[PDB]
């Protein structure tokens, strides 16, 4: 039978890949970074508290100005907060209250949302009437939308629960490119700083790298023990960190095709929900189901501090484009800014 | 540009006013999550409530809306964690088909022991009891073939059979209920409880049952809040 031969050949290719990965594993980055000085204790405090949400929060994204932000809750509202003065600029009602993601366009002209409705809704912040209104509704996914990010005002990359990613042109409303190959639900994606590539992590404990222009899965990483919930590029763009449900974070390199760092502790037994790097990439902020946040030294794997300000699980987390502050949103319907 | 800051101030004030206006309605409405396998009667239940994601009904000036997720894929692992604040989960079980009952019990156990759903009570609707009645009366499909413990099960004394009901039917239906309550009580731990109910496709009083069960859930949540219960 041809199926058995194909399975045997795939197993042989997997063995070859493992052998090639072990060949390049001459040493570990722990030995190389054992000679650098520790960053010291990092104790951040809640400088701003953003209250007003009615239910659990799932997403946030700081814009290029590092001033405005977006947040989604299960009351069906999208609130645009001004991080500096804690003011609310907009409060966008949603037709479907079960949203899970948000995106802030680099130009600040659009916001995005999506969830169990299987629709990616784009709202125009800059309106001539002074009132925010929806612009486009992107349909075609057969699963819940997990995360979406803007490339520009004309291209949006979306991740859905039907194990597929899709690059859409907002104006035409059509799926310009379709990314397939994942077996389980894909939960998060991040775009590269040059927007040339983007990685996405799924429930099959695997991350896949995709070229936006051609839709071909360039490379694939495995190693997680459970479902992947978070992913974000290193600020350099040649590495990325992933959080999983097995209480471990893993930092991989694009060119090395291997796992570089594993961040875990024996006293944490809950999954990771959000992961993001700082401006220099030295601090990796991760959110945990144990109602806390932890900052890892992305170079020495040692915890540099804890952000215990939430009484419920933290679901979204983010750093500025300027590296100035970090926002955490949890299921208690509050956002907190740390600096 | 203090004028701009003042303008943002009244914009914020208006936004908070509208947000409180919506908050009153949100607190005044009750979420419900409808779940169950296919060919169970969930469509019939929502039709009686008058295939759709959402349903809205009002009983005694109390507004309930039920969410039934059909567009999502077969996996229920991660799109269910967004239902941790619903008032209750209406679990519909087809009692007439013994082949797929074990899947229903496994799903109920998975919902009951869920880390994010340990506070969510489950209202159990054992639908299509008439078909189970003809099934047990025919004697072609024996429960002992699928559930050996039924051979040694005795009907509980706190049973309220309908007039003229065959006690074999009563024993079978209460055996199914006993299995479900056995699954429920193992880790009930006082946070959440299961409310069994015996219903048929021709019932028109279903909406009242969920109303009473939600009243009981809120009463018991308040009692546990004050440490009485």
């Amino acid at each position, epitope marked *: 039978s041809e199926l058995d031969q194909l399975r045997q050949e795939a197993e042989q290719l997997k063995n070859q890949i493992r052998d090639a990965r072990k060949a390049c594993a001459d040493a570990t980055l722990s030995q190389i970074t054992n000679n650098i000085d520790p960053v010291g204790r990092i104790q951040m405090r809640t400088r701003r508290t953003l209250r007003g949400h009615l239910a659990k929060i799932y997403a946030m994204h700081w814009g290029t100005d590092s001033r405005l932000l977006v947040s989604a809750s299960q009351d069906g509202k999208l609130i645009i907060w001004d991080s500096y003065t804690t003011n609310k600029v907009h409060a966008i009602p949603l037709r479907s209250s079960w949203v899970m993601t948000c995106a802030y366009a680099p130009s600040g002209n659009y916001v995005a949302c999506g969830g169990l409705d299987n629709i990616c809704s784009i709202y125009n912040l800059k309106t001539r009437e002074g009132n925010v209104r929806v612009s486009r509704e992107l349909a075609g996914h057969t699963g819940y939308l997990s995360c979406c990010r803007f490339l520009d005002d004309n291209q949006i990359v979306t991740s859905s629960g039907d194990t597929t990613c899709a690059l859409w042109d907002i104006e035409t409303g059509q799926q310009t490119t379709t990314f397939t190959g994942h077996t*389980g639900d894909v939960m998060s994606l991040s775009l590269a700083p040059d927007t040339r590539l983007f990685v996405s992590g799924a429930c099959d404990a695997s991350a896949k790298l995709w070229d936006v222009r051609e839709g071909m899965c360039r490379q694939t990483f495995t190693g997680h*023990e*459970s479902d992947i919930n978070a992913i974000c590029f290193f600020p350099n763009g040649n590495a990325f960190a992933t959080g999983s449900d097995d209480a471990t974070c893993r930092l991989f390199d694009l060119r090395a095709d291997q796992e570089l760092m594993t961040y875990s502790h024996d006293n944490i037994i809950c999954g990771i929900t959000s992961v993001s790097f700082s401006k220099s990439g030295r601090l990796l902020l991760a959110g945990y189901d144990d109602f806390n946040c932890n900052v890892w030294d992305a170079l020495k794997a040692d915890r540099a501090g804890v952000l215990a300000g939430h009484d419920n699980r933290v679901s979204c987390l983010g750093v500025t484009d300027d590296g100035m502050a970090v926002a955490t949103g949890s299921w208690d319907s509050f956002l907190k800014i740390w600096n | 540009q203090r004028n701009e800051e003042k303008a943002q101030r009244e914009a914020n004030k208006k936004i908070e006013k509208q947000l409180q206006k919506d908050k009153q309605v949100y607190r005044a409405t009750h979420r419900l999550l409808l779940l169950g396998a296919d060919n169970s009667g969930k469509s019939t239940i929502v039709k009686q409530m008058r295939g759709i994601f959402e349903t809205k009904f009002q009983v005694d000036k109390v507004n309930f809306h039920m969410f039934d997720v059909g567009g999502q894929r077969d996996e229920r692992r991660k799109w269910i964690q967004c239902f941790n604040d619903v008032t209750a989960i209406i679990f519909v079980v087809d009692s007439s088909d013994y082949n797929r009952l074990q899947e229903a019990l*496994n799903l109920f156990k998975s919902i009951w022991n869920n880390r994010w759903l340990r506070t969510i009570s489950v209202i159990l609707f054992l639908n299509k009891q008439d078909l189970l009645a003809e099934k047990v009366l025919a004697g072609k499909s024996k429960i002992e073939d699928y559930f*050996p413990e039924f051979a040694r099960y005795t009907t509980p004394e706190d049973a309220t059979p309908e007039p003229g009901e065959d006690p074999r039917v009563t024993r079978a239906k209460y055996f199914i209920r006993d299995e479900f309550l056995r699954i429920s009580t193992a880790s009930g731990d006082g946070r959440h409880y299961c409310y069994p109910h015996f219903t048929c496709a021709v019932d028109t009083e279903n909406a009242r049952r969920i109303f009473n069960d939600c009243r009981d859930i809120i009463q018991r949540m308040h009692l546990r809040q004050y440490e009485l219960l």
Partner: nanobody, 128 residues
């Protein structure tokens, strides 16, 4: 990379005894609840067995109650299922399915279409 490989089974006369061994590699076997799932020809996947993290709690399907025995060895990282007195309706393809999350008594692995944490499947056939 998660790899759950099951072995054993095949053609056998009714009433025989068979042993199925599931090999788990690439993860902590002790921290995961494990299940045995079979797929009857022409029917969807159905739950057949269960085992907890420490083996304290053991459950079976009512149909296979009293005939199937499940054994778990955390040190060797191998899951065993021993079947005796097979029935002609017990023929199916058996998968070694792992429960989705660690340190949890919850499983959603009875899914039919796609599930990452399952093996290819070992066919067992009973006939005269």
């Amino acid at each position: 990379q998660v790899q759950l490989q099951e072995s054993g089974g095949g053609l056998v006369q009714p009433g025989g005894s068979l042993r199925l061994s599931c090999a788990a590699s690439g993860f902590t076997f002790s921290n995961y609840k494990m299940n045995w799932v079979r797929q009857a020809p022409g029917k969807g996947l159905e739950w057949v067995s269960d085992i907890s993290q420490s083996g304290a709690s053991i459950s079976y399907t009512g149909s296979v109650k009293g005939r199937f025995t499940i054994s778990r060895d955390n040190a060797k990282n191998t899951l065993y299922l021993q079947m005796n007195s097979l029935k002609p309706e017990d023929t199916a393809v058996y998968y070694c399915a792992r429960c989705p999350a660690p340190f949890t008594r919850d499983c959603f692995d009875v899914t039919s279409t796609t599930y990452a944490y399952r093996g290819q499947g070992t066919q067992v056939t009973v006939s005269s």
